[PDB]
Design a binder for this molecule. Structure first.
Ligand SMILES: OC[C@H]1O[C@@H](O[C@H]2[C@H](O)[C@@H](O)[C@H](O)O[C@@H]2CO)[C@H](O)[C@@H](O)[C@H]1O
Ligand SMILES: OC[C@H]1O[C@@H](O[C@H]2[C@H](O)[C@@H](O)[C@H](O)O[C@@H]2CO)[C@H](O)[C@@H](O)[C@H]1O
Ligand SMILES: [Cl-]
Ligand SMILES: [Cl-]
Ligand SMILES: [Cl-]
Lengths: 150, 149
């Protein structure tokens, strides 16, 4: 059911999501971490404004320093909320990945390389998300959606 | 019989509490028969048993028998149905017995009937929210049991 919106995008990438993130929607992102990455992020946004910065419903932020971790959070009206830090991370420098974000009624579920990684409860209604951004030190092969509606 | 909380010949419609969480690898095993004149039946994995307002249905597994037959799968959230996922390759038949095995995975249900893979259904509600098994419609149930993880 997977409809890619882009292949091999320049980073940072900001694109419109062409349908609503209804429960059962999948987001699939394939890419590769450069050898000298410190971090990258996948942001599910309400719009693409820079000034002031668009709300980030779901900020998914792998960080590579020390033992590595993933930080998840939400940006509302240019303020970050409570960090949810996952210390069990599958990402590594100079390694390829496939991220699958499953949109559920109450939360996102993320799996990497076919293995569950983390959950993150909705803080912004997922119906408000219309934009996906990818930022930081990462190579992206593809970004696709499997919409519930299709 | 390694199954757990086995019930025979429940009264239909059946609404029962699932006796443990639907963790990955959990099985729900339902043996029964399709009446000769069935239109449809359903197996519903529900968040509670409220009738009004109607409990959320994480997984509605709905064999339909008109025309060439099919299985409709869907989810009910806050009393509204989502987009149907229709399986046209259906193993069910009027007057035929079945054994349904629902395997719960972290990201989907995997359903087999009489030992044959039937369909996949990706989660729309987290399966940890499911505490209730409903069986409704034109169907005969011989047994229900579970294999937990
Ligand atoms: O919360 C996501 C957000 O983190 C910012 O950095 C935080 C940092 O994670 C924390 O350990 C420190 O105590 O506060 C910092 C200031 O906000 C990042 O700057 C931002 O890009 C997001 O990743
Ligand atoms: O989707 C499950 C749901 O279907 C309802 O019937 C649908 C029907 O399948 C569809 O063809 C039509 O467009 O809308 C009907 C109402 O949503 C059933 O009423 C319900 O019991 C479930 O089986
Ligand atoms: Cl940021
Ligand atoms: Cl949920
Ligand atoms: Cl119904």
């Amino acid at each position: 059911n997977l409809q890619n919106i882009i292949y091999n995008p320049v980073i940072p990438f900001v694109g419109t999501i062409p349908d609503q993130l209804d429960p059962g929607t999948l987001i699939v992102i394939r890419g590769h971490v450069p050898s000298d990455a410190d971090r990258f992020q996948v942001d599910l946004q309400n719009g693409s404004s820079m000034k002031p910065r668009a709300d980030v419903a779901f900020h998914f932020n792998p960080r590579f320093k020390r033992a590595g971790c993933i930080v998840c959070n939400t940006l509302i009206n240019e303020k970050w909320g409570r960090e949810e830090i996952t210390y069990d991370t599958p990402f590594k420098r100079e390694k390829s990945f496939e991220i699958v974000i499953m949109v559920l009624k109450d939360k996102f579920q993320v799996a990497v390389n076919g293995k569950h990684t983390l959950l993150y409860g909705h803080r912004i209604g997922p119906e408000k998300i219309d934009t996906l951004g990818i930022y930081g030190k990462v190579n992206i092969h593809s970004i696709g959606f499997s919409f519930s509606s299709d």
